[model samples]
Target: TVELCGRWDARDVAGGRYRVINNVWGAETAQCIEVGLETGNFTITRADHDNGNNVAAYPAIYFGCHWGACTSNSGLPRRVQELSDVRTSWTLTPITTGRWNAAYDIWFSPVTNSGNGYSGGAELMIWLNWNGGVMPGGSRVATVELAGATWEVWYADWDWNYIAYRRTTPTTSVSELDLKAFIDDAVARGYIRPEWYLHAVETGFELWEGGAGLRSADFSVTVQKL
Candidate 1:
């Protein structure tokens, strides 16, 4: 969103730098003042470009992140359902889609397991109510795995960090209440965090360890008619 059709403005206000006008646009009125700037001396001219060109999908929809922003598909990173050459387990089944109250469990394993190959490695268990459609986080309903086993004998519910979204249904009051109660219980148990761990909540499905050392994988299921 850059509007370079009018005059730019700048003014010193703070301690270290001066404010700068970055964009401009037109309105119904012929004259107006904007952000301490008067548009009286400038003849706004639309920049030259291929205005007729149209892109079907957002460039980000296909390409990966650029600079510091992820493309359109940069929402929650997809979860792992099946894998090879390592450990694999499913804490959820049916993997139903549709808005669901997701629960993620991240426990701590203070004890080290060398027989498993890695001297001191960890695991991840993700639980999510797949909102039947291609919402985000895949059709994963719930997931659980080793977090810390050798830390100590006492662990608090707050130690678990996860995330959950509101799952509203118009079914029987008992059913709706049950769903809400379960989701709330999970949240209170620290099963859902402020957001999906460190991932964004976008559409599509994937399991990519961009800068992380984790492997890159993906799996998606068709929910509803979409």
Candidate 2:
């Protein structure tokens, strides 16, 4: 058990099959997370940001890599077309009254490896539980069915495409989620190519205000190939 309170503190866990990060990037205020390597769980010990225009931070755990930091033997950066399935069971306990969202942040790189930042890959986000009327990086484009629910797909363009899927009904706990469905959706829309590499599968809370109790509990991700 370890507490991460710095601006960008990170640790590897699960035999380096996964990595956790306390990315306090948007605000100058302080934040922290107590990451457990064995169980792959983390808890927010302290958070001090109040509904800023930009999200305060993303405290997350992930498979594959981030910013050239790759996990050991993750078997990721797998070609999307070759993948038969990819999914996760995330037991996320989000606070009822706060400005935040519990979501999955997936990245598709051009090559089968990590890079510094923005390498023409698309970012796909799935919002399982969220509140505070805060929207993602873009505008809503489509309402589609996925993972036993309806989703409002948001789209945006910068150096790379940002595609976000927000659950229309909004639930807190997820038993199992089909991540490949969203990835296939992105591919069909031309937002990403099937040949692209599925670089990362990450889960965390995007905190904009008081998120001390946000808990990433009982997390697991699995991938299958052809």
Candidate 3:
């Protein structure tokens, strides 16, 4: 089990360089268990939440490293433009009831300084399964196929750019996918910049409320620089 704040700050877990996080950014009262991280596999139980549209917590793991010497950050290709390819695979145990989504929050920043504070540039979300009717905050923009499934894209301008991809058909697992495919698609659509710093690549459940028995059985990612 772990407490929440920015990130739990656990070191690289698996050989792929991913880090585990009990990232309850929206609500401090939430907590979770960190089963393991070193084997490219982990489990989490989001012990609590109030059940709302606003995210209450994110108990997740991530790959790669952060650009600036920020807290709880990890892998490589410090810059997005320098990245050639990346891969992620996971298996999420299905949840019969929970206001949460098995997802990935890939972040980017325009600045390259290894500073103390954090800033936002772009946020790309990939939703594997949305349990309950809770959805991302954006209007549907497009629908395309990538990573062996069809996804609906969404965009919003609530401060920084928010781009989200939701699977048309919800599933609990993904075999292996080149994450760059989604990034390249977003680039082609002009939603992200290649020059932006690839700040973080995170995968976890964004819980709204009532996430008692949620788990990410196995998770792994590999990021590479060209």
Candidate 4:
């Protein structure tokens, strides 16, 4: 395990199969994270952030291309129509009083080579647990049971589509969740196109305040093609 404390500190783990990032993107604040080499799991060692609607940071691990960097053998950027499965599981130990959400951020793009820039695509967020009244950035359109839990589906459009599946009953972990299920749901709602490419799968905590003691104990993602 290695420690990362800088605002933009990042490193590749599992022989470049994954990348962990200490992304303090929203506001200037102090944050530190411990990145594990074997699993890309992370723990927030310290965080001194203020509470606001804007998230202070997203300390995450990713299994595909992001900011022009692609992981080794990630098997991503695959066309949605060709994808058979995109499954993941993660466990989180989070502070009970923090303003944050333990979530997965999945990206899709019209171009297969969308590296640093998001020309236009979809951003799908899966929220497993949250505290201090955090909410996804969209209007709730429907609710359905999937992946062993009921979820409130949210959708919004700006430069691209933003869809969020927020669990009605928050849980601390997901043993296995097929992300393509949410993708197909988004397709049914006309938010994602089958011809688009699946870009990345990232999991982490979106924090607004008091994020210390948060731990990503385990995480994994597997992609399969038809």
lDDT winner: 4
lDDT of each: 0.21, 0.86, 0.71, 0.88
Ranking by TM-score: 4, 2, 3, 1
* Model 3: per-residue Cα lDDT over 140-187, one tens digit each: 999999878899999887555788999998888886677888888887
Residue 2's lDDT within candidate 2 is 93
> For model 2, what is the error of residue 116's alpha carbon versus the real structure, in angstroms, after optimal superposition?
1.3
For candidate 2, the C-alpha RMSD (Å) to the true structure equals 1.4
| Alpha-carbon shift of residue 64 in model 3 (angstroms) | 2.4
Backbone clash count, each prediction separately: 35, 0, 6, 0
- Residue pairs with backbone overlap in model 2: none
| lDDT for each residue of candidate 1 in 1-226, tens digit (9 for 90 to 100) | 1222232322211221112121222221121112211211111122221112221111001111112232233231222111111211112122232122122222222222212221121112232333323232213344322221111111123333223222232111111112222223343544433222222111111111111111111211111110
User: Which stretches of model 1 miss by more than 4 angstroms?
Assistant: 1-69, 73-185, 193-226
How well does each candidate superpose onto the true structure, as a TM-score?
0.16, 0.95, 0.85, 0.96
* Residue-by-residue lDDT tens digits, candidate 4, 36-72: 8888888999889885889999999988877667888
- Of 2 and 4, the candidate ahead on TM-score is 4
**Comparing 1 and 2 by TM-score, which wins?**
2
Residue 40 accuracy (lDDT) in model 2: 70
